[PDB]
Paper text:
High-resolution cryo-electron microscopy structures and biochemical analyses reveal that [name] binds with nanomolar affinity to the [name] and NOT8 catalytic subunits of CCR4–NOT, obstructing RNA access and displacing a catalytic Mg²⁺ ion from the active site.
To understand the binding dynamics of [name] with [name], [name], and NOT6 and to elucidate the mechanism of [name]-mediated [name]/8 inhibition, we determined the structure of the [name]:[name]:[name] complex to 2.8 Å resolution and [name]:NOT8:[name] complex to 3.5 Å resolution using cryo-electron microscopy (cryo-EM). The high quality of the density map enabled us to build a complete [name] MIF4G domain (residues E1093–S1317). [name] contains most residues (Q10–G263 out of 285), with only a few flexible residues missing at both termini, while [name] includes all residues except for I19–V25 in the loop connecting the β2 and β3 strands. The principal interface between [name] and [name] is primarily formed by a section of [name]’s β5 strand (residues S101–F103) and several adjacent residues (K96–G100) immediately preceding it. The β5 strand of [name] assembles into a short β-sheet with the β3 strand of the [name] (residues A48–P50). Specifically, NOT6’s β2 strand (residues E33–I36) forms a β-sheet with [name]’s β3 strand (residues A48–I51). This interaction interface directly overlaps with [name]’s binding site on [name], underscoring the mutual exclusivity of these protein interactions.
Numbering used by the authors:
A (entry chain C): 10 to 263
B (entry chain B): 1093 to 1317
C (entry chain A): 1 to 18, 26 to 125
Write the structure that this text describes.
Amino acid sequence: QRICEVWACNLDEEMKKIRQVIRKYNYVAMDTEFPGVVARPIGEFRSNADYQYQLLRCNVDLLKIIQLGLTFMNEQGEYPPGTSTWQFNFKFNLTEDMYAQDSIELLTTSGIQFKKHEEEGIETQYFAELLMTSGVVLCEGVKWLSFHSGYDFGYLIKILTNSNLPEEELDFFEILRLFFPVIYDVKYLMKSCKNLKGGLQEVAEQLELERIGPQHQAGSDSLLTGMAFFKMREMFFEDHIDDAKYCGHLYGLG
Amino acid sequence: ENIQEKIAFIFNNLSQSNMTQKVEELKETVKEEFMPWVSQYLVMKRVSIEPNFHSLYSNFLDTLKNPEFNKMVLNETYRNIKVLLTSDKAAANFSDRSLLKNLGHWLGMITLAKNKPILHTDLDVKSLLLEAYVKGQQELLYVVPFVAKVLESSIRSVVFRPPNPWTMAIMNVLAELHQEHDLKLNLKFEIEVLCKNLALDINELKPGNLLKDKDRLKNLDEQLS
Amino acid sequence: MKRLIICNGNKLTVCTQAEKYTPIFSLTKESDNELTLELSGVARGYYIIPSELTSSQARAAHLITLLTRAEESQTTDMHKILNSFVSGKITSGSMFNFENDGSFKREPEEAYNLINKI
Ligand SMILES: [Mg+2]
């Protein structure tokens, strides 16, 4: 069972395993599933990277996260024996909540059970309380890997702070460097990588990575991000990633 | 023993004016081998009995800028807290109950105020409150004042400010305790003061049903004795 | 014929297509908590609000039902925006695009790029 599907019943039991994994396996590849984009900001913006935060702010504050996948690796790119990925399935009502129909249609095809989410999902406030003291956030030595994670980290900050996103992009990143001191966006690193273009699935065919788990789900996508980072780091970055050039930069934001 | 009298001399005359000078005095006097003894001396002999000089020593740690020494101090703080928690909770040990308050105040300043968490594997605060409730009334005298001193430093943290999900996790457990008709008034008044310190309203908190789940209070991991 | 909702702080304006749009009504959040309904030019001579509804949010949700031709017992994506504004969940200036049936405007290509991270 490489990917463990976490519900409200086994969240506390699976947090005990996570709290011991992070000590040895400090690289966290992650991905989230969210119901899409339904809102656009009003006004004129001085930059395209400022409109992207206000568009990000407009939607994270209104919609809620559906899934989160966490994959743990070490500096050598190796996985814990047994389970390396955890898929956290949060509470979501398809009648009382706001969503984009094209996103719900595209998530239903992947295999997301929206009736289980409504009845047996996790509360994000209880998950954030458990995640605050686990050692996965706010702790030195933990490196976070991601792929086009503007929306993914906005939803994480939304539940970790239990409030709306900061009105300014400067304050969003100030609180981002506190919970996640090190962030590697694989899509941002691909700009310096020759011939690497496309989405997660498109780019994990130039690197020749075979996916484990169902597509377009947080657990399997986060696992694919982890193999993408360590393979791309091996060919293009010579097994070393500059922290002064690539750490903390999210794709589109900035 | 001559070096022992010089570590006590450094901390005896510490102040905001000579803090930078005395940080250098420690470095040229105490070597790396004797560093674990200094962390033990600072927590046991200074932090535990001197609540007024806590920002002085917290600023000393920042000025010293030694991450290895900061982990020794944090590990020694947890070691000393757990010695008091797993002890004989007599009703006349007024001094042992004051040591836990001073160590709790110190712990929050070096973890919460520095935007650092109190790790679950190091000290599980929420289950400490639930375990003390079911153990008895003397265990609540040790834990509620100790927890209230730890959460005082949450207001000075942009991460652990009251809107934090983890801070209201603890504050909602204390709201359940405040609703108990058996909790003594001296402990009810301490929870009310903590709410005023965090600029919170005790009436606006959301107490759950954590204290009525007897099947969950039976398999609690034991941090007290 | 699409619809649009703009939330510019304390005001929620509902407009219909005409890509120009003409406002239908605006729901202003007054000082303490009061909502005020202000129908547009040709709105009072077009829509009749039964006397059963009294609150400004009940007549706003009744006009959205008349606009989107939804059933008597329904909550469209336009109602969800109205219910979020009245409870103060929309705290930033945003526009919402809707279809004629009140659901959020369909963007098949944008949703493909979001899950695929293209
Ligand atoms: Mg995904």
